[model samples]
Target: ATVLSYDGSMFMKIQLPVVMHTEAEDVSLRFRSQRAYGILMATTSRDSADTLRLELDAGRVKLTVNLGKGPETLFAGYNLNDNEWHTVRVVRRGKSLKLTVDDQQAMTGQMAGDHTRLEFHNIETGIITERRYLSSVPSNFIGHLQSLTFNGMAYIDLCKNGDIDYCELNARFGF
Candidate 1:
């Protein structure tokens, strides 16, 4: 069985390789972090409880982690890790949360009572991955996170969705 683990410390972290499509219509790739296990990733600056966060606009990202009850206690940019590989996988199919690991069903409960926009695939940390998001995701961390394939409600159309035909557009323009 694949045991996704992490160590709560100043160093030693995990980073997952993600292939996301922001054009999804409904469903999305989901993953959550433990609340008590906060304080895993560290900031380059002063000490901070929250650090790990994603780079998404507003309604384009959703990271669900047990950050304790209540809305005020939103998963702050804190950090947490246990040095253990924790298999975190989530697939949304019609308003249902299918959380799994090791290809085994874990949490099949309803939404965590949050409307958090899950921005395709992302490397979740102790405090619910990163907060601020980016247009085109850049390089993520390494190790610990391992790798997980995510599927959403919509499919990314690289060519078919384009306005004009690729061959014709290029020929008419320049190249």
Candidate 2:
């Protein structure tokens, strides 16, 4: 299997051909890291304040989303920086959010606002270069990432296969 390797200075920024307009999203990815902190994936809106971010902090997987309201966060798993492959999944439906890591029980959260629609302009991984709207920048990733799927689209594979023209990647391909 092909995986993208990041050594603290790499990143992938994908400009979506069309803005994502949806009330729900499902994102899943497999990763292996020895670092305690790193951004796994993130999405931002161009027209609204909507943002979704998945990251590892203190070896714990965390998912945060802001749907034109206050941010809601869900956390699962722990001590995940063991350099072993782990699967992370995020599910969002309107104001409800769910996060699962490996075989651990899923964590759930509820949003505080009435906004259900999320507008995404880009899908980012490894590092977040667009920081104008972020409250704080996340740590750079150093490890391997594979099988990244958003909604029903396998974006990483699409980028590797040249099926998408809007992906800007600086990470190397391989184990």
Candidate 3:
């Protein structure tokens, strides 16, 4: 019954301490936003600063990921966040990124292969770095994250005092 809640003020941390090996994998989650503009997930690195971000802006889902260059909008369209639950899927493979919303529409974009290492370990939920609010959109997300998964690791429980580990998982030999 633990849910990561955000209210335009705080965000949920994803990979602050997990330190998992991130290969070309898929990130999927189910969320419902009370507002129209807020970031669902943001992942990048200090080495690049411009990597991947999934968010809802102006009632649309957007996926922005960069390898060695500035962020690129792989997909940004379709009405969303109607105060109801919706599923989002983002996949990274080779030099391209794909986004699928509600298992309906899908969009894919290619990236420069300047970096082959998957930099998704430093990921966050409900907010983006620098809290960038574009196009008059809200900077933080106001919603409930029912479920979130990176690769196949699902966030189960938060440590004591709501520790930043984000979730509790059984690493037991990679399940």
Candidate 4:
């Protein structure tokens, strides 16, 4: 079992607004789980189970980023669940929301965006399997968030986000 410790001072959060791709290239926030089961998210619903997502009004799109192979789900799941301090982050810029765990890109996918001002959520789960602001969310990042940052810039594509798409590389490797 991994032991994690944190002070409320480190849990600072602010809701900043950006102009999306117009004034800013991207809009995202990052966090390092000081423990093994930390969580970061964006939600405005009083219940976490609500399917409605807070997105843009410009009808851009949504992107999901992860630390493992992209899941067929809208949310992100971490890989380092060994009760060690891990890292996790979710960023949405333009038409993409990228997720990262321990400085690694797990998954990447795009979603259609609606035109509206978006809101960012920061959720903390000590070590619970499903912790959420309103509903049941998986206990991910059961570690302390050591460091968190956001890159409001642009990248060519999610594939070049330091992640290896083995399925795509198989051809180059000669499967």
Please identify which of the two predictions, 2 or 4, would achieve the higher TM-score against the true structure: 2
Worst 10-residue lDDT window, candidate 2 = 43-52
Provide the global lDDT of candidate 3 against the true structure: 0.63
- Compose the digit string of candidate 2's lDDT tens values, residues 22-99: 899999999999999999998976666578899999999988898887677778999999999999998899988889
Estimate, for each residue in 19-109, the C-alpha lDDT of model 4 and write its tens digit.
1222112333333333333333323222233222211111111232321222223434443434344445555453454554446655554
Quality of model 2 by C-alpha lDDT: 0.87
* lDDT score, candidate 1, position 74: 18
Position 99, candidate 1: lDDT: 44
**What's the best-to-worst order under TM-score?**
2, 3, 4, 1
| Model 2 root-mean-square deviation | 1.2
Q: Tens digit of lDDT per residue, candidate 1, span 1-175?
A: 1212333321221232343222212222222333332332211112122122221112122234221121111121222222333443444442354544434444454434544333333323323333343212322322233232324211112112342232111101010
lDDT of 3 by residue, 36-131 (tens): 678887775544454567788787887776655555686545567788888899998757678888887677777775764455446666555433
The better-scoring model by lDDT among 1 and 3 is 3
Which numbered prediction scores highest in TM-score against the true structure?
A: 2
Given candidate 3, what's the lDDT at residue 36? Answer: 69
lDDT at residue 103 of model 4 (Cα atoms): 60
